[PDB]
Amino acid sequence: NDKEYDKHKRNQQARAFYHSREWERTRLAVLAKDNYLCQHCLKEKKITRAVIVDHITPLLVDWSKRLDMDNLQSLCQACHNRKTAEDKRRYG
Template sequence: MTLGGGGNGKKALPFYNSPSWRKTRKAVLARDHYLCQICLKRGVLEPAVIVHHIDHLKERPDKALDEDNLQSVCAVCHNRLHPEKGKQQEELKQRKARVIQARANPEII
């Protein structure tokens, strides 16, 4: 089973689909009462939907299932923790051509 995250996360997919990860993820969400731990520190109650590796999976695969290395976070906080993932989407947006339809002014024709 490959644990490394690679740049696109596809290499880590088998790990995130494994029964051991699913069990650990469920335990961490329950431990954190399904609340984003980052928002909670600011006094905000926000549901957690992601379990985040504090020490990144590709850098520390030995801590992949270590509950002390995992925290429940909301999608917004997870995106802040991983700004590099948003860059891929920005690059795609920049590549798209913007099409503008031009029409002749009927008053001049």
């Protein structure tokens, strides 16, 4: 297919994913496993409530890992922001 169309379809698929029953359930499973604590803060010896579950390898980078618990971490906002910058260095 046309490259820009493939990009469109990937982005539409990713948008739909966050509405999915599978994501809703898996998000909850990760937060529960993590005891609602930010996993980056915990590794840095800090206690912070998580507010988001993030893909380690981003969803748009590897669709196949979208529901893998070892590809998901509960994060606070500050750690999500830090990770976003880190990921720009890796993937643009």
